[PDB]
Amino acid sequence: FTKELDQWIEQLNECKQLSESQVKSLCEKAKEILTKECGDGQFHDLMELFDTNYLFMGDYVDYSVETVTLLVALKVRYRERITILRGNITQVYGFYDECLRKYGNANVWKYFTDLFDYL
Amino acid sequence: SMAAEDELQLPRLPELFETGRQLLDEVEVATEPAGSRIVQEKVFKGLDLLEKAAEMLSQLDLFSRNEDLEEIASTDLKYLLVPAFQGALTMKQVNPSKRLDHLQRAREHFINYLTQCHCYHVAEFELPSMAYPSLVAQRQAKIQRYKQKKELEHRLSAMKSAVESGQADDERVREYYLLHLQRWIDISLEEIESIDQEIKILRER
């Protein structure tokens, strides 16, 4: 019974942020997974020529709080079921400021920064 | 007026410490918003209390820098945690105009904590540089650190009651405080890394 994620993901698709408490709870769930070894900001990829679903991150180059939040919530709900790709991350001034505008403070940014240090 | 001063009895060390500890605990699980008056007032009070504890400790000189950890009494062990709590509380302040100030102040608290734990051989670790930035170029360390913290927190959760309710021998009591110190070594290390990243961002602006 992980319907809690469903609610979060549903909420994020409407582009409504999550709360600090939830953002924190999400990162910990992820960290828990990490430390061991279906349709929607993101964009659909079909494959060609001769499994799992495919997703591309961002438009082309340049990320919003809700985007990266959704990224995490997705991978926690679906694991290998959804492969997510970008070109060639938490450490940008625009993203820090965005967290700071949408939350009382810098905690959410810390939670993510911490979390992505596991990738 | 000299009389009134002689006659006033202010909180002593154990109270100062215990209250500042309660306050930090409260802020860490506050179901109110972080930057609300309710939480921010507790942070201000806590820092004030710990600031007073820190001064008491300085005057008492409980901890030298050329001493063995066995020479420190069991109940004095907790006082080692003060700088780490100061760091923690400092981070819990919200006031963006002064964020860079808070990070540098916090970093210094955590370094103080780490520096002491390191002289006393509380655990084997690499002591971070005294000043931003502590160069680090790596993910494995974090996985290891995460598993370590989960294991410490579990052991602690099994012993807390026994100690607080006075049903633990001295051996048990010391092992418990050792475990807190280690737990807080990990936390401080992790926070300094976090702080250095936030400063880098704030500076470049």
Q: Quick count: other Cβ atoms within 10 Å of Cβ A83? A: 13
C-alpha to C-alpha distances, B99 to A84, A100, B9, B103, B143, nearest whole angstrom = 34, 12, 36, 6, 29
B3 assigned to some structural domain:
no
Domain boundaries, chain A: 1-119
Find the domain containing B194 and state its range. Answer: 11-205
Residues of chain B neighbouring A118 (CB-CB closer than 8 A): 139, 142-143
Contact A105 B200 (CB under 8 A): no
What resolution does the deposited structure have, in angstroms?
A: 2.8
SS3 of residue B190 by DSSP: helix
CB contact under 8 A, A114 and B194: yes
Domain-embedded: residue B185: yes
Cβ of B94 within 8 Å of Cβ of A104? The answer is yes
Q: Is A35 on the interface with B (CB under 8 A)?
A: yes
Report yes or no: A19 at the B interface, CB cutoff 8 Å: no
Helix (H, G, I), strand (E, B) or coil at B11: coil
Q: What is the CATH number of the domain that holds B195?
A: 1.25.40.540
**Does residue B163 lie in a domain region?**
yes
Tokens representing A28 are 């910990």
Q: Which chain B residues are closer than 8 Å to A20 by Cβ? A: 33-34
The answer for residues whose C-beta is within 8 angstroms of residue B106's C-beta and 6 or more apart is: B86, B87, B90, B91, B191, B195
Confirm or reject contact between A31 and chain B (CB < 8 A): yes
Distance of alpha carbon B101 from the chain centroid? 18
Domain contains B159: yes
Structurally, chain B folds into a number of domains equal to 1
Cβ contacts (< 8 Å) between B193 and chain A: which residues? 117
Which residues does residue A55 pair with via DSSP β-bridges, in sequence order? A44, A84
